Each structure stands twice: as structure tokens, then as C-alpha cells.
Design a binder for this molecule. Structure first.
Ligand code: CA
Lengths: 75, 253
């Protein structure tokens, strides 16, 4: 549908960073991008969405994410 | 709040081969750059006196050059936004004008990029070599890893129906201007009626400056294309005989 959504990653640090992602792109791509941009490794941070941890294989569609939703990240 | 999904760049042949008004037009270009503050600048026809200007005037860009003698290309990366990964210079074996393909693998917004620029062979009579270089470029864009996003922007010196004869852009390669619907306002990057640098009043105009990019569908989306350097400087001239191109794109994971 030539469509994607905007997701925000919010840190303990107060930083919010926006990404665009298609609804059936695996979220690992977004986690890997955030680690590259912020210079962090997967091993130290963890990603959650509406309370729950995020598997690399899961898509926005499968987690029923929506435009302007926020993923939380914890050290 | 920060936007990792929008990258911007300018590509611009700055006519380093025009020695008169060198300091002034140089400052003009740097000011145009400060206005827009792009993440990447692709420069062609840079001379060494023009590089020194950029070191201290645009000191916020790291600078990578395609050569050091005569005139060459250069890619400028915004310090802090762009993370230099590696660099590679691909020769054009039959070049009679020291042209080559400069490739810079970077990170931007956490997205892997391979950035490429060149100043393909010049003049009407060297069309044959210009097409061979385009095929090398087109060719190098596909060698790149599937994971990375390749962007090429340069002074192709291309003429109508030349791309048509070269065999056409390949399937996973698009022209940003064609993608946006061939907009009229930025259709000519070399315009002798609205530009008086070379001082040849005969009204010839071409789309020499072009942006190509490889990417899976809907993963790199051109948002806008605009001329830059439309500002008549103090001497009465423009920063170059070329308009530069400003491009904003969306990166979608
Ligand atoms: Ca020139």
C-alpha cells in the first residue's frame, strides 16, 4: 500500500528518536538501527512495547503497533 | 525529539575550473550550505584552493576527496550526524579527464549508506566514454550489499536519449527527479538563460546533475528536489555555472 508508520524510541535519558518502518518489517531492523545511531550494543539495552519485551522477529503488524507509537528502551 | 527517518544532501558542480571570483563564489557556496545544513554534500570540479576554503569555512563537515591534483570530486559528511565507515575510489580506465567514482560507506540515523559521486566525462564528443562510465556507476551500485542503501549524485553531463542508448537505468535504480514526477522548477541544473557565469548567450540547457539511488520498493522515498545557488553574488555572478540540487529523502526500515 506504499505505507509505513512512524515509531518513536524513548530512552531513560529523555531522548526521543523517530523512525519510519513498514508494518511487516521485523523490528530487529529498528533495534539494530537504534543501536547504530546511539552507539549502543544490544547486550546492554532492552526494548519493550506496551509493557512487553520485543522479539526480533515480531513486526509492528503482529504487535498491532500504530503510527506515532512509542517503544521504550531500558539500560 | 529527533528524526532519524529523513536525510538531506546537496550535489553541486561548483566550477573549480573558473579561477576568476574564486574566493567569492566559494563563500557563496558555503553560505548556501549553512542555510540548509545538509547531512552530506557531493561536490564536483573541486580544486585544492577550494578544499582549503571548506576546511575552515565548513569546518563542521569531514571531507573526503576523489584525488588531490587538478580538479576532483569530494563528499562532505556532517560531523555528529554521519559516521564514516570506509572509503573507496573506483577508476575510469579510459578517462581523458581524470574522472573516477568516489564511494563512501557511512552510517546516518543508524542506516547504512554507500554514497557515491562522480563527474562523468564531459562534452558532446565524449558521449561514448560518458555512457561507459554510467554503466560502471550503474554497475557499482548493484555490487553493493543488499543491506546498505546506495545513493549516487553527481554531474553526469548526460544528454537526452543518452540514458536511452546506454540501455536505461536498471530495475532497482531510480532517478529522484523522475520519481517525483519530473518537476519543472528543478528540471534544468545547467541553464544559460538564467545563469551568466560561462558568458555564452545562446540558450542551451540540460539536466546534467542527477541523483540515482538503489533500494527495495518504498524503503527510500524522495520527498523534495530544489535548485540551490540561485543567489546572485556580490560580483553579479552566481556561485557556479551549475545550479546545485537539494534533496530530502525518507528512509523507511
Ligand atoms: Ca566547469
Amino acid at each position: 500500500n506504499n505505507d509505513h508508520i512512524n515509531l518513536k524510541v524513548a530512552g531513560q535519558d529523555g531522548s526521543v528518536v523517530q523512525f519510519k518502518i513498514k508494518r511487516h518489517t521485523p523490528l530487529s531492523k529498528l533495534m539494530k538501527a537504534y543501536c547504530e545511531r546511539q552507539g549502543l550494543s544490544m547486550r546492554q539495552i532492552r526494548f519493550r512495547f506496551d509493557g512487553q519485551p520485543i522479539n526480533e522477529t515480531d513486526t509492528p503488524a503482529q504487535l498491532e503497533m500504530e503510527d506515532e507509537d512509542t517503544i521504550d528502551v531500558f539500560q | 525529539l529527533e528524526d532519524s527517518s529523513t536525510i538531506s544532501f546537496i550535489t553541486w558542480n561548483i566550477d573549480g575550473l573558473d579561477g576568476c571570483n574564486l574566493p567569492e563564489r566559494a563563500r557563496g557556496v558555503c553560505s548556501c550550505l549553512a542555510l540548509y545544513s545538509p547531512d552530506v554534500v557531493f561536490l564536483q570540479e573541486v580544486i585544492p584552493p577550494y578544499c582549503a576554503y571548506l576546511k575552515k569555512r565548513a569546518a563542521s563537515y569531514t571531507i573526503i576527496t576523489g584525488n588531490e591534483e587538478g580538479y576532483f570530486t569530494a563528499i562532505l559528511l556532517k560531523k555528529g550526524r554521519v559516521k564514516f565507515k570506509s572509503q573507496e575510489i573506483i577508476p575510469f580506465p579510459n578517462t581523458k579527464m581524470m574522472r573516477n567514482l568516489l564511494c563512501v560507506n557511512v552510517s546516518l540515523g543508524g542506516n547504512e549508506f554507500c554514497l557515491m559521486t562522480s563527474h562523468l566525462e564531459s562534452t558532446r564528443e565524449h558521449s561514448a566514454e560518458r555512457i561507459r562510465q554510467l554503466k560502471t556507476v550503474l554497475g557499482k551500485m548493484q555490487e553493493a550489499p543488499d543491506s546498505t542503501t546506495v545513493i549516487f549524485a553527481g554531474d553526469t553531463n548526460l544528454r537526452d536519449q543518452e540514458v536511452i542508448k546506454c540501455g536505461g537505468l536498471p530495475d532497482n535504480v531510480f532517478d529522484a527527479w523522475e520519481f517525483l514526477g519530473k518537476p519543472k522548477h528543478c528540471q534544468y541544473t545547467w541553464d544559460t538563460k538564467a545563469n551568466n557565469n560561462l558568458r555564452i548567450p545562446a540558450a542551451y540547457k540540460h539536466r546534467f546533475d542527477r541523483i540515482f539511488f538503489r533500494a527495495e520498493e518504498g524503503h527510500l522515498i524522495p520527498q523534495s528536489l530544489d535548485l540551490v545557488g540561485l543567489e546572485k553574488l556580490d560580483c553579479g555572478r552566481f556561485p557556479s555555472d551549475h545550479w546545485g540540487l537539494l534533496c530530502t529523502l525518507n528512509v523507511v526500515l
